Each structure stands twice: as structure tokens, then as C-alpha cells.
Write an enzyme that holds these catalytic residues in place. Structure first.
Site, PDB file in Angstrom:
ATOM      1  N   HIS A  78      12.229  -1.717 -41.561  1.00  0.00           N
ATOM      2  CA  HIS A  78      11.105  -2.660 -41.695  1.00  0.00           C
ATOM      3  C   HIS A  78      11.228  -3.548 -42.884  1.00  0.00           C
ATOM      4  CE1 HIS A  78       7.188  -4.386 -41.263  1.00  0.00           C
ATOM      5  NE2 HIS A  78       6.736  -3.860 -42.392  1.00  0.00           N
ATOM      6  N   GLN A  80      14.233  -4.406 -44.253  1.00  0.00           N
ATOM      7  CA  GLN A  80      15.315  -5.326 -43.980  1.00  0.00           C
ATOM      8  C   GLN A  80      14.787  -6.420 -43.113  1.00  0.00           C
ATOM      9  OE1 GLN A  80      18.032  -1.621 -43.590  1.00  0.00           O
ATOM     10  NE2 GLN A  80      19.319  -3.444 -43.978  1.00  0.00           N
ATOM     11  N   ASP A  81      13.918  -6.093 -42.160  1.00  0.00           N
ATOM     12  CA  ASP A  81      13.474  -7.118 -41.261  1.00  0.00           C
ATOM     13  C   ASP A  81      12.758  -8.108 -42.053  1.00  0.00           C
ATOM     14  OD1 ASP A  81      14.428  -6.264 -38.829  1.00  0.00           O
ATOM     15  OD2 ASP A  81      12.650  -4.985 -38.578  1.00  0.00           O
ATOM     16  N   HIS A  82      11.904  -7.611 -42.918  1.00  0.00           N
ATOM     17  CA  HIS A  82      11.077  -8.422 -43.773  1.00  0.00           C
ATOM     18  C   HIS A  82      11.884  -9.321 -44.686  1.00  0.00           C
ATOM     19  CE1 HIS A  82       6.723  -8.678 -44.869  1.00  0.00           C
ATOM     20  NE2 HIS A  82       7.298  -9.621 -45.604  1.00  0.00           N
TER      21      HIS A  82
END
Lengths: 102, 102, 102
Positions: A78, A80-82
């Protein structure tokens, strides 16, 4: 070490990326108001923030490349996605400043 | 499926998608020169390059769909973020090239 | 949490964010046709759908935060990437709709 450390890394990326993200939104708000100077400087403030997160990720990628095992966990994902999604938002924001300015 | 095969699948994805991404910024650079045909085309190169990473990703989850176990690894997370973030930057770039053309 | 549950969750995220993504693209098509009404409306439907996806991601995160163990599988990574890029894509689009008008 290790599970706590990765939780700290994850949170470092998320806090800093979330900061970058509303700064990118501030920049969108400025270009909305024809105020390109504000939009541009906000675009660089978000950079400042964003690389704190980037470096967090890089250090994490560096540890993996070298052999120390990193067990993922949904908060890392989450995070990394961010980062990466915030990086891409900012890349878009830049380009959009450029249409705006004409 | 083994940790080495997965590491390779990853850099593949990262490598191809990094390349697609620079190509998309080339198409951005072209929309700045008012080179709307260059830009159109680079968006196609970028697509040719991306389908590579994309194909790699789809085989990995196809492989997962069919019951092969895949331990994750932070570089995979990072590869997938590159593909999916690059893909989405490209989608933005298609839309913005329309806007430019007005 | 719990393989069946996490696959369900992942598919819930992919399906609903996939749908929200196509709706966002509708908003892009409707922008292109000069039709700012539809596009604004479609951006809100996309949101209605995206929200279902965000909720399911939030439940997972919140489950993880409460100490529940969650082995992430590529499918989850992929679903999260679909959710977060699709959010980012709505975000650009909200802005681009603004620019279309100016």
C-alpha cells in the site's frame, strides 16, 4: 528489525507520499486559479517531500538486492502504491501545468 | 516457481516498462513542440514496449491462477507498480494529446 | 484471512475498480465530445464504484492493523495496483475536466 523496521519503512513512505500528494493537489488548485507561479513552486515542494519517500523505497530495494530477506506485507504494498502513484500524479501535474500556461 | 525465475520476470517488467515510460515522456515532449504526430507515434512505441511488461505480468498471474505458488518479493511489487503506473501515465498521455489538439 | 477470503477481496477490488476505470474513460470520451455534463456525472459514478473498491482495501488494511496475518499474493498486489492507479486516473480527469472547460 525486521517486521517493526519494515513497518517503519512502510509508514515513512506513506506519510511522506501523502504529504506530496496534497501538495500536488494544492498545485492543481493553483493552476485552476491561473496562478502558475504558486502551482509551479508547490510542484517543487511536493518533490522535496516525495523523494524522502522515494529514498525510503530505494533503501528497501537496495537491502533486497544484497540478500537480506524482506517479507512483504500489505502495508508495504500500500505504501509502494502510494509513492509510485503519487509520483505519477506529479508527473501528470507537471505536464498539465504546461497546457495550462497556454 | 523459483525465486530466480521471479526475479527475472521482475526486472523484465521493470526494464520494459521503464523504457515505455521514457517513451511516454518523449510523447509529452512532442506535445510541447506541437509535434502532434510524433507524440501520436511515440505513444505507440511506448505501447509496443509496455505490452512486453504487460505480457510478462499476465503470465505471472496466469501462472498463479493455475495454482503455481509465487512468493512475493519487494522487487515484484515494484515491477508491478512500474507497469501499472506506466500504463496509467500512458492513458493520461493519450487523453492529453487530444486536449493539446484543440 | 484465509485464502478464499483474500481471493474474494482481491476480486472485489479488481472488478469494482475495473468498472470504475471504464467509467472514468467514459468521462474522457465525454470530455472529448465537448459534453462536460456527462463527464462530470461519469466522474461521480466512477467514484461510486471506486468507493466499493477502496472500502474493501480499507477493511484489509484495518484487519492487518489489528494484528491479523495476511499473506499477500500477486493477485492482491495486482488488485491494489488497479485500485490505486484507478484512483490516480480519476484524479487526473477531475483536473482535466476543469482544463477542458477553461
Amino acid at each position: 528489525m525486521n517486521t517493526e523496521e519494515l513497518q517503519v519503512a512502510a509508514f515513512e513512505i506513506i506519510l511522506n507520499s501523502g504529504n506530496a500528494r496534497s501538495i500536488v493537489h494544492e498545485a492543481f488548485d493553483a493552476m485552476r486559479e491561473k496562478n502558475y507561479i504558486l502551482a509551479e513552486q508547490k510542484l517543487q515542494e511536493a518533490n522535496d517531500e516525495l523523494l524522502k519517500a522515494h529514498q525510503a523505497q530505494t533503501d528497501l530495494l537496495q537491502e533486497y538486492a544484497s540478500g537480506t530477506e524482506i517479507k512483504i506485507e500489505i502495508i508495504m504494498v500500500h505504501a509502494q502504491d502510494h509513492l509510485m502513484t503519487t509520483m505519477t500524479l506529479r508527473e501528470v501535474a507537471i505536464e498539465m501545468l504546461e497546457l495550462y500556461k497556454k
